Amino acid sequence: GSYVNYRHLALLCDTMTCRGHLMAITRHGVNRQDTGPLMKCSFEETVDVL
Amino acid sequence: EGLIDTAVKTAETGYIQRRLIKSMESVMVKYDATVRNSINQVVQLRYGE
Amino acid sequence: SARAAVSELMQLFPRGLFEDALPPIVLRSQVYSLVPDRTVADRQLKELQEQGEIRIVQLGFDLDAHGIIFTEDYRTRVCDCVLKACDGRPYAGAVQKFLASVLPACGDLSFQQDQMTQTFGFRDSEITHLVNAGVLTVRDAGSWWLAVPGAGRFIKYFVKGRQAVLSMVRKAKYRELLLSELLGRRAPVVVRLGLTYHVHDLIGAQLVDCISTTSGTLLRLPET
Amino acid sequence: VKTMKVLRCVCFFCSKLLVDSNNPKIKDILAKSKGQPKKRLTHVYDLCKGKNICEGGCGRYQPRIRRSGLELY
RNA sequence: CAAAAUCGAGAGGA
DNA sequence: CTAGTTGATCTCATATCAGGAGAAGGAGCAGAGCGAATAC
DNA sequence: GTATTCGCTCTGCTCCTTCTCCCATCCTCTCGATATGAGATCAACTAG
Ligand SMILES: [Zn+2]
């Protein structure tokens, strides 16, 4: 019965399919796109990234 | 049962919150009125359609 | 004399197949084929190599593979092709220095770092220049063999041709075959260098038994 | 790991690429991966892992390396 | 004129 | 110019089970297709 | 001279084994464990 606006759900879905394949919200999908090294090292798995 | 539930849900939900935040954080509405990420690619031509 | 034998064998080389980029190459084993006295063959080849008419290069595909090349074909083809394809890129000058200084001086098969660093004042940068020229290849850390640019194509064709010829002898009856029969037979497309060339190589390395019969010299595979 | 990968993509005896640069299979990899050296190099690896011979090269068996601990066999 | 370590274990609080 | 002193520095030497999930690499099998090769 | 094989290659499919990363935030407290000198060089004196 809860409620959440639609803008937020749409933004999450569109972020998560914006590259043409399904992107997982994990170090496998988030940390493998082209975000540049420093943000990647911040999220997870620092040593390998740098 | 109720006590253990309250005491064992929290870790996983916290992980999900962290993971989503790091996923989406840098998307923002621009002066073009578009929505874009840090890399400057389009995510939504207008916020929320 | 070995000098003649290398001359005739060099004639058999199909230069057109390698678009005259590679100088003609003769394998020491083939020199043994035309000169049965193996020891005299080796002594006279050493004689020639000392005189500076020919170079001997470790082809590597077999530990006993030493290719024999006239020095002038080597110089001509390397200068022409390397400098042409490499006009401007730096190692042209280094290779020029190498051909001018080392090759006339020492005909040795391998080059060790100390010699080039001291006797010839070559630097690490220039040695890398040569290595990228194809002129040197790594024996060990700080050791390199002389080499012909582009030899890989010839090596591949020679290997496949040798194994094909050996297979053809194997599939003949007895595992035997007469030399005239082999030479007259239509060469497989794999055998790109010509059959006489490969036959001499097989005979010289004792891979095939040469039996002089009333009908000629028969090829038989030694029992393995 | 990067060392192993660069080795497995060059000639252990003559020190250059097992595969040629001008082949379409690598030219299209270059065209596809611009600004993505990770994807470039991984494409070159998965293309070259099937190569087992150095073939204007040195034509010698390039050994299937392995690792145990900190060591390369 | 700034004086007062680090590392592990345990028990707690919201 | 030129012999004598002082300190700093350095060397040697003494004994006595109730994780899991996902990626990567290699393994073994399976058949397709093409070079030559027998053979009708 | 073309079937016909056939062996060899060349993918390439599964299938297993290996390896490597991750696990809510913030805060208070207690308790236990974790040399000595002879000699030589050298440089700055320290004077003649
Ligand atoms: Zn090589």
Side-chain angles (χ1 to χ4, degrees), chain C residues 137, chain D residues 11-16 54-55 57-60 62:
Chain C
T137 180
Chain D
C11 194
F12 178 51
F13 298 86
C14 61
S15 187
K16 295 200 90 76
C54 197
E55 65 85 20
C58 175
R60 194 42 180 160
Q62 317 297 269

Coordinates of all heavy atoms in Angstrom, one line a residue, chain C residues 137, chain D residues 11-16 54-55 57-60 62, ligand 1:
Chain C
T137 N 67.1 -11.5 -33.0 CA 66.0 -12.1 -32.2 C 66.7 -12.7 -30.9 O 67.8 -13.0 -30.9 CB 65.3 -13.2 -33.0 OG1 64.3 -13.8 -32.2 CG2 66.3 -14.3 -33.4
Chain D
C11 N 55.4 -12.4 -28.7 CA 56.3 -13.5 -29.0 C 57.4 -13.7 -28.0 O 58.3 -13.0 -27.9 CB 56.9 -13.3 -30.4 SG 57.6 -14.8 -31.1
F12 N 57.3 -14.8 -27.3 CA 58.2 -15.1 -26.2 C 59.6 -15.3 -26.7 O 60.5 -15.3 -25.8 CB 57.6 -16.4 -25.5 CG 58.5 -16.8 -24.4 CD1 58.9 -16.0 -23.4 CD2 58.8 -18.2 -24.3 CE1 59.6 -16.4 -22.3 CE2 59.6 -18.6 -23.2 CZ 60.0 -17.8 -22.3
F13 N 59.8 -15.5 -28.0 CA 61.2 -15.7 -28.5 C 61.6 -14.5 -29.3 O 62.8 -14.2 -29.2 CB 61.2 -17.0 -29.3 CG 60.9 -18.3 -28.5 CD1 59.7 -18.7 -28.3 CD2 62.0 -19.1 -28.0 CE1 59.4 -19.9 -27.6 CE2 61.7 -20.2 -27.3 CZ 60.4 -20.6 -27.1
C14 N 60.8 -13.9 -30.1 CA 61.1 -12.7 -30.9 C 60.5 -11.4 -30.4 O 60.7 -10.4 -31.0 CB 60.8 -13.0 -32.3 SG 59.0 -13.2 -32.7
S15 N 59.6 -11.5 -29.3 CA 59.1 -10.3 -28.7 C 58.3 -9.4 -29.6 O 58.6 -8.2 -29.7 CB 60.2 -9.5 -28.0 OG 59.7 -8.4 -27.2
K16 N 57.2 -9.9 -30.1 CA 56.2 -9.1 -30.8 C 54.9 -9.9 -30.8 O 54.9 -11.1 -30.4 CB 56.6 -8.8 -32.3 CG 57.7 -7.8 -32.3 CD 57.8 -7.2 -33.7 CE 57.1 -5.9 -33.6 NZ 57.9 -4.8 -32.8
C54 N 54.3 -18.9 -33.1 CA 54.8 -17.6 -33.3 C 54.8 -17.2 -34.8 O 55.0 -16.0 -35.2 CB 56.3 -17.4 -32.8 SG 57.0 -15.7 -32.6
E55 N 54.6 -18.2 -35.7 CA 54.8 -18.1 -37.1 C 55.9 -17.1 -37.5 O 56.9 -16.9 -36.8 CB 53.4 -17.7 -37.8 CG 52.9 -16.3 -37.4 CD 53.5 -15.2 -38.3 OE1 54.0 -15.4 -39.4 OE2 53.4 -14.0 -37.8
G57 N 58.2 -13.9 -38.5 CA 58.4 -14.2 -37.1 C 59.5 -15.2 -36.8 O 60.4 -15.4 -37.6
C58 N 59.2 -15.9 -35.7 CA 60.2 -16.9 -35.1 C 59.6 -18.3 -35.1 O 60.4 -19.3 -34.8 CB 60.5 -16.4 -33.7 SG 61.5 -17.4 -32.7
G59 N 58.3 -18.5 -35.4 CA 57.7 -19.8 -35.6 C 58.0 -20.9 -34.6 O 58.0 -22.0 -35.0
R60 N 58.1 -20.5 -33.3 CA 58.4 -21.5 -32.3 C 57.2 -21.5 -31.3 O 56.5 -20.5 -31.1 CB 59.7 -21.1 -31.5 CG 60.3 -22.2 -30.6 CD 60.4 -23.6 -31.2 NE 61.0 -24.5 -30.2 CZ 60.9 -25.8 -30.3 NH1 60.2 -26.4 -31.2 NH2 61.5 -26.5 -29.4
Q62 N 54.9 -21.1 -28.5 CA 54.8 -20.1 -27.4 C 54.1 -20.8 -26.3 O 53.0 -21.2 -26.4 CB 54.0 -18.9 -27.9 CG 54.3 -18.4 -29.3 CD 55.7 -18.0 -29.4 OE1 56.0 -16.8 -29.2 NE2 56.6 -18.9 -29.7
Ligands
ZN1 ZN 59.5 -15.6 -32.1

